[PDB]
Design a protein around this motif. Structure first.
Motif, PDB file in Angstrom:
ATOM      1  N   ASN E   3      27.919 -70.196  -8.994  1.00 43.34           N
ATOM      2  CA  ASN E   3      28.071 -70.180 -10.442  1.00 43.34           C
ATOM      3  C   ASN E   3      26.890 -70.810 -11.172  1.00 43.34           C
ATOM      4  OD1 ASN E   3      30.575 -68.936 -10.133  1.00 43.34           O
ATOM      5  ND2 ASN E   3      31.652 -70.897 -10.048  1.00 43.34           N
ATOM      6  N   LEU E   6      25.495 -69.043 -14.527  1.00 45.90           N
ATOM      7  CA  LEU E   6      26.124 -69.159 -15.837  1.00 45.90           C
ATOM      8  C   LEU E   6      25.308 -70.007 -16.799  1.00 45.90           C
ATOM      9  CD1 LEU E   6      29.833 -69.596 -14.742  1.00 45.90           C
ATOM     10  CD2 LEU E   6      28.809 -67.611 -15.832  1.00 45.90           C
ATOM     11  N   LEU E   7      24.422 -70.857 -16.290  1.00 45.23           N
ATOM     12  CA  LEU E   7      23.563 -71.661 -17.144  1.00 45.23           C
ATOM     13  C   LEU E   7      22.398 -70.871 -17.718  1.00 45.23           C
ATOM     14  CD1 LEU E   7      23.498 -74.878 -14.974  1.00 45.23           C
ATOM     15  CD2 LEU E   7      24.743 -74.532 -17.075  1.00 45.23           C
ATOM     16  N   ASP E  11      24.407 -67.896 -24.414  1.00 46.77           N
ATOM     17  CA  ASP E  11      25.381 -68.679 -25.163  1.00 46.77           C
ATOM     18  C   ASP E  11      25.166 -70.173 -24.989  1.00 46.77           C
ATOM     19  OD1 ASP E  11      26.398 -66.280 -25.923  1.00 46.77           O
ATOM     20  OD2 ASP E  11      28.373 -66.542 -25.005  1.00 46.77           O
ATOM     21  N   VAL E  12      24.546 -70.590 -23.887  1.00 44.08           N
ATOM     22  CA  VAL E  12      24.203 -71.996 -23.721  1.00 44.08           C
ATOM     23  C   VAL E  12      23.112 -72.385 -24.704  1.00 44.08           C
ATOM     24  CG1 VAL E  12      23.367 -73.719 -22.114  1.00 44.08           C
ATOM     25  CG2 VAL E  12      24.899 -71.942 -21.318  1.00 44.08           C
ATOM     26  N   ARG E  14      22.555 -70.801 -27.586  1.00 36.08           N
ATOM     27  CA  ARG E  14      23.170 -70.754 -28.905  1.00 36.08           C
ATOM     28  C   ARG E  14      23.948 -72.027 -29.202  1.00 36.08           C
ATOM     29  NH1 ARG E  14      27.881 -66.432 -30.106  1.00 36.08           N
ATOM     30  NH2 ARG E  14      28.755 -67.651 -28.376  1.00 36.08           N
ATOM     31  N   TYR E  15      24.551 -72.626 -28.176  1.00 39.40           N
ATOM     32  CA  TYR E  15      25.327 -73.844 -28.367  1.00 39.40           C
ATOM     33  C   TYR E  15      24.429 -75.025 -28.705  1.00 39.40           C
ATOM     34  CZ  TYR E  15      28.575 -77.632 -27.221  1.00 39.40           C
ATOM     35  OH  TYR E  15      29.351 -78.762 -27.253  1.00 39.40           O
ATOM     36  N   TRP E  18      22.958 -74.848 -32.318  1.00 36.36           N
ATOM     37  CA  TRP E  18      23.921 -75.243 -33.338  1.00 36.36           C
ATOM     38  C   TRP E  18      24.051 -76.756 -33.414  1.00 36.36           C
ATOM     39  CZ3 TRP E  18      28.219 -78.189 -33.322  1.00 36.36           C
ATOM     40  CH2 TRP E  18      29.048 -78.120 -34.442  1.00 36.36           C
ATOM     41  N   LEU E  22      23.058 -79.132 -36.759  1.00 33.51           N
ATOM     42  CA  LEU E  22      23.963 -80.119 -37.330  1.00 33.51           C
ATOM     43  C   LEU E  22      23.323 -81.497 -37.368  1.00 33.51           C
ATOM     44  CD1 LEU E  22      26.953 -80.296 -38.356  1.00 33.51           C
ATOM     45  CD2 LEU E  22      27.484 -81.157 -36.100  1.00 33.51           C
ATOM     46  N   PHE E  66      40.187 -67.428 -35.918  1.00 31.09           N
ATOM     47  CA  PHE E  66      40.712 -68.062 -34.721  1.00 31.09           C
ATOM     48  C   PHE E  66      40.290 -67.296 -33.478  1.00 31.09           C
ATOM     49  CE2 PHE E  66      43.799 -68.152 -31.351  1.00 31.09           C
ATOM     50  CZ  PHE E  66      43.997 -69.493 -31.139  1.00 31.09           C
ATOM     51  N   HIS E  67      39.893 -68.039 -32.447  1.00 28.42           N
ATOM     52  CA  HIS E  67      39.711 -67.482 -31.129  1.00 28.42           C
ATOM     53  C   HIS E  67      40.063 -68.574 -30.132  1.00 28.42           C
ATOM     54  CE1 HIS E  67      35.612 -69.367 -30.461  1.00 28.42           C
ATOM     55  NE2 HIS E  67      35.750 -69.456 -31.770  1.00 28.42           N
ATOM     56  N   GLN E  69      38.909 -69.957 -27.631  1.00 28.34           N
ATOM     57  CA  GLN E  69      37.873 -70.895 -27.222  1.00 28.34           C
ATOM     58  C   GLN E  69      37.168 -71.524 -28.417  1.00 28.34           C
ATOM     59  OE1 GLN E  69      35.417 -69.209 -24.162  1.00 28.34           O
ATOM     60  NE2 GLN E  69      34.214 -71.082 -23.915  1.00 28.34           N
ATOM     61  N   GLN E  71      37.576 -74.142 -32.207  1.00 25.07           N
ATOM     62  CA  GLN E  71      37.849 -75.509 -32.619  1.00 25.07           C
ATOM     63  C   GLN E  71      39.059 -75.532 -33.541  1.00 25.07           C
ATOM     64  OE1 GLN E  71      36.095 -78.113 -31.421  1.00 25.07           O
ATOM     65  NE2 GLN E  71      34.769 -76.722 -30.274  1.00 25.07           N
TER      66      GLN E  71
END
Ligand code: CDL
Lengths: 119, 269, 59, 74, 73, 61, 75, 75
Positions: E3, E6-7, E11-12, E14-15, E18, E22, E66-67, E69, E71
């Protein structure tokens, strides 16, 4: 979030569940157990969990973090501060998404509309 | 194959830090003596845990230490009402059988948890989603009936209520969005271009003076003469602002046999 | 002499020293925390007197 | 009282002291009400990331063994 | 070893972008005055609104969607 | 007279600023420790510097 | 409030009054013991024991006073 | 409340006055017991019992004051 120094205790007690905890005001008596001299203004002692925070700072300045901070007056302040912000974080969330759980909320026991009575 | 040591061992570099919370001379002197001979003392007890040996907690004289429980006004009376106030004493007095019983969880916090659905009910949910993303929703009837049949009813009620909660939280989050994204009267027509090139430090005490007279040395050279003159100027401006005053409204809580409104309390009694 | 020869001078000073909050504010001023006062803050004692049942006008 | 550290920071208690009078001290509490609704909303816009990154899926059939911890009864 | 890939997913990235936006956004937030009013953070509201308007669409029925995964707390 | 420093106010115009200084100065109550002063207070002498709680070097070290 | 603390420490000083009367009472006690011994020296040991015993009762008031003082000073 | 409490605690200090006079009364009493013992030691035990007995009448006022003290201190 609480935007004041004072809050009604009943507003943070449950209406349909057993009440095993309260959200008490700051324990001002613990402030007199600090043996050393310190400056504290009365305008900061009522806001929730901040008194225990300032006390922890006063104790971490006079003493450090090793072999001198480990005295009952200083550890209880650190434990109170850490516990106060955890309880208030949970109560604040519970107030945000579960306002129907608390006394004083009009949704804990909703009053019906007059159209539902059949008169 | 050496035993593993926790991070706390590298702070103290020993397993025998004789930490006693009781601040009496007899106790701290004995600990300093015991702290020095812990290497060759058979009566030595560890307070820093390790992979090979457990440890003891903080010592209180001959007994053990635990912080005073966070104040909790909940109590249960046995003989007479005690009117227990957790803020009236520093340390919580012991609970006598004939006097009081305290609330549960001397050392407890409020959390939210969830039960774990049965394993077979989980497998039916995995098979439905899998058949959903592969074959589509319209071809998952058999997988949907297996859920309603294999999953016990207490689980179907939880699944039913989870949707209603997240539907509630979804609205509570969007209402905050609406209040947050609302344009107030003091920001009408203002955009990112009208923002100042300032950071958090520019609103602190060094750059932005607090609303107190003795925050800095601003008013340290003021004399009584300058004050008397200022009192005359403020009264001059009050000759034009005091002309208006809000009118007294009716007391909504005039009737004592009526549920009063939780109106904002006055600043002073 | 003016303070002793008065009737309300004893009260205006006693009701002020008895109000624990006003004395808490004074304790802060002595430590270095002071600021300006609104018309509502100036009457903090009048509100205290009224609560006791005194007849005070000019709130 | 959620968002404790955020509110204490906005009131300026990390660098200054509140006014000693209740009138202004209370207005300063109500002044952050907008900012809390904003900072809370920002914290709810985080994008997703694979759950199978630092955590193995506990629903995988590999873990149906329900194995116990073998110990030594010293 | 199974696995690790996956890194490499975007999306990693994109996270993390964000999280930094902030950080830069909250670093720019500042107190503008000490009048004890909401206008003391007048400019900061615009900064945060730009952040929210950058990851949502205010002109929708439900800007926060809403999804599973997502907040909630 | 008013003294200037690194900590500045939050007003756009100069009249609003002067109005703020006049409001604060009108509330000052001077307490001197020296006899023969119109504002004399042996006890209850107000301090003229505000205390700020900060983490010391022993704290951060 | 602040004055309550001031009167507390003031009371703590008042405890020095029995300390004064205890001194005079002790001198008087030993003053009589001297004359008493001269009257009947055959029982010096008996008189002596009674002398210290009475003095012990004096220190009782002393410890009682300072005890009250430190209490009111902290309670 | 706080104003009256200040004089309350001050009054509690007044209770230390009998603590002083009780000490002096003790020093004087045992003095008479000693000198009187020398003149007639044949009745030692009699005098001795009356001595401590008299002392009991001294701590009477002592406890009475402290009782009255804490009383007005809270009543
Ligand atoms: C049972 C019998 C036996 C018992 C016998 C004894 C009983 C003793 C207990 C006391 C009885 C009650 C009287 C208490 C008076 C209060 C005293 C006090 O707190 O000090 C503050 C007092 C005022 O402070 P300040 O510095 O002027 O404040 C200026 C600020 O700008 C102020 O501005 P601010 O904005 O900061 O405001 C602060 C706030 C703070 O508020 C408070 O803290 C509350 C204070 C508590 C009192 C408030 C209620 C007062 C109501 C008025 C009625 C008074 C009746 C008195 C009755 C007496 C009983 C016979 O408000 C005040 O300032 C309060 C003002 C206090 C005035 C007190 C009344 C003055 C009495 C006038 C008569 C003077 C006689 C002097 C004779 C001396 C002989 C040695 O300080 C003084 O008065 C200094 C002393 C007088 C100057 C001359 C120097 C004399 C030195 C004497 C040395 C010997 C001491 C005694 C030795 C005894 C053993 C030998």
């Amino acid at each position: 979030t609480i935007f004041a120094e004072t809050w009604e205790a009943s507003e943070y007690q449950y209406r349909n569940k057993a009440n095993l905890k309260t959200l008490p005001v700051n324990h001002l008596g613990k402030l007199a157990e600090l043996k050393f001299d310190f400056v504290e203004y009365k305008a900061h002692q009522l806001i929730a969990c901040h008194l225990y925070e300032r006390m922890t700072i006063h104790c971490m300045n006079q003493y450090g973090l090793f072999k001198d901070f480990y005295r009952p007056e200083c550890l209880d302040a650190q434990y109170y501060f850490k516990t106060c912000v955890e309880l208030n974080a949970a109560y604040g969330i519970q107030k945000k998404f579960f306002p129907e759980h608390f006394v004083g909320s009009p949704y804990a026991r909703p009053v019906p509309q007059f159209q539902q009575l059949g008169l | 194959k050496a035993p593993g040591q926790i991070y706390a061992y590298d702070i103290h570099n020993t397993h025998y830090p004789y930490v006693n919370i009781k601040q009496d001379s007899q106790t701290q002197l004995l600990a300093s003596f015991r702290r020095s001979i812990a290497s060759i003392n058979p009566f030595s007890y560890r307070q820093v845990p390790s992979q090979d040996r457990a440890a003891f907690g903080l010592r209180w004289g001959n007994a053990w230490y635990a912080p005073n429980p966070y104040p909790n006004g909940i109590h249960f009376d046995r003989v007479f009402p005690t009117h227990y106030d957790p803020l009236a004493e520093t340390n919580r007095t012991k609970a006598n059988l004939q006097l009081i019983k305290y609330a549960p969880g001397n050392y407890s916090t409020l959390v939210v948890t969830s039960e774990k659905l049965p394993r077979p009910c989980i497998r039916t949910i995995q098979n439905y989603r899998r058949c959903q993303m592969v074959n589509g929703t319209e071809k998952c009837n058999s997988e949907a009936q297996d859920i309603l049949a294999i999953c016990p009813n207490w689980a179907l009620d939880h699944m039913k209520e989870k949707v209603r909660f997240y539907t509630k939280a979804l609205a509570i989050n969007n209402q905050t969005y609406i209040r947050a994204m609302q344009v107030e009267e003091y920001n009408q027509g203002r955009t990112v271009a009208d923002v100042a090139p300032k950071t958090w430090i520019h609103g602190t005490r060094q750059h932005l003076r607090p609303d107190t007279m003795w925050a800095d040395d601003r008013y340290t050279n003021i004399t009584q003469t300058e004050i008397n003159e200022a009192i005359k100027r403020v009264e001059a401006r009050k000759a034009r602002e005091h002309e208006k005053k809000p009118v007294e409204q009716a007391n909504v809580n005039a009737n004592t046999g009526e549920q009063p409104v939780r109106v904002e309390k006055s600043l002073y009694p | 002499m003016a303070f002793l020869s008065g009737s309300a001078t004893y009260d205006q000073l006693a009701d002020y020293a008895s109000y624990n909050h006003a004395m808490d504010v004074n304790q802060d001023q002595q430590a270095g925390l002071d600021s300006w006062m609104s018309e509502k803050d100036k009457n903090m004692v009048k509100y205290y007197q009224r609560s006791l049942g005194k007849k005070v006008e000019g709130i | 009282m959620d968002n404790y550290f955020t509110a204490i920071t906005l009131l300026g208690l990390r660098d200054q002291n509140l006014p000693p009078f209740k009138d202004a001290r209370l207005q300063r509490y109500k002044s952050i009400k907008k900012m809390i609704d904003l900072i809370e909303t920002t914290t709810k816009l985080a994008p997703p990331m694979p759950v199978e990154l630092f955590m193995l899926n506990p629903t995988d059939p590999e873990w149906d063994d329900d194995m116990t911890y073998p110990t030594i009864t010293h | 070893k199974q696995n690790e890939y996956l890194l490499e997913h975007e999306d990693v990235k994109r996270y993390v972008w964000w999280y930094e936006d902030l950080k830069e956004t909250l670093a720019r937030v500042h107190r503008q005055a000490n009048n004890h009013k909401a206008c003391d953070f007048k400019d900061s509201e615009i900064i945060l609104q730009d952040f929210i308007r950058r990851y949502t669409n205010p002109k929708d029925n439900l800007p926060i969607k809403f999804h599973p995964q997502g907040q909630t707390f | 007279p008013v003294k200037e420093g690194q900590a500045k106010l939050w007003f756009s115009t100069k009249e609003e600023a002067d109005a703020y200084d006049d409001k604060m100065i009108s509330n000052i109550e001077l307490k001197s420790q020296d006899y023969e002063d119109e504002n004399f207070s042996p006890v209850f002498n107000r301090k003229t510097q505000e205390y700020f709680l900060e983490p010391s070097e022993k704290f951060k070290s | 409030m602040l004055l309550v603390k001031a009167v507390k420490v003031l009371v703590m000083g008042g405890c020095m009054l029995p300390i004064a009367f205890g001194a005079l009472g002790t001198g008087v006690l030993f003053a009589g013991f001297n004359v008493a011994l001269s009257r009947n020296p055959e029982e010096t040991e008996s008189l002596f024991n009674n002398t210290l015993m009475g003095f012990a009762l004096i220190e009782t008031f002393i410890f009682m006073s300072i005890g009250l003082g430190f209490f009111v000073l902290f309670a």
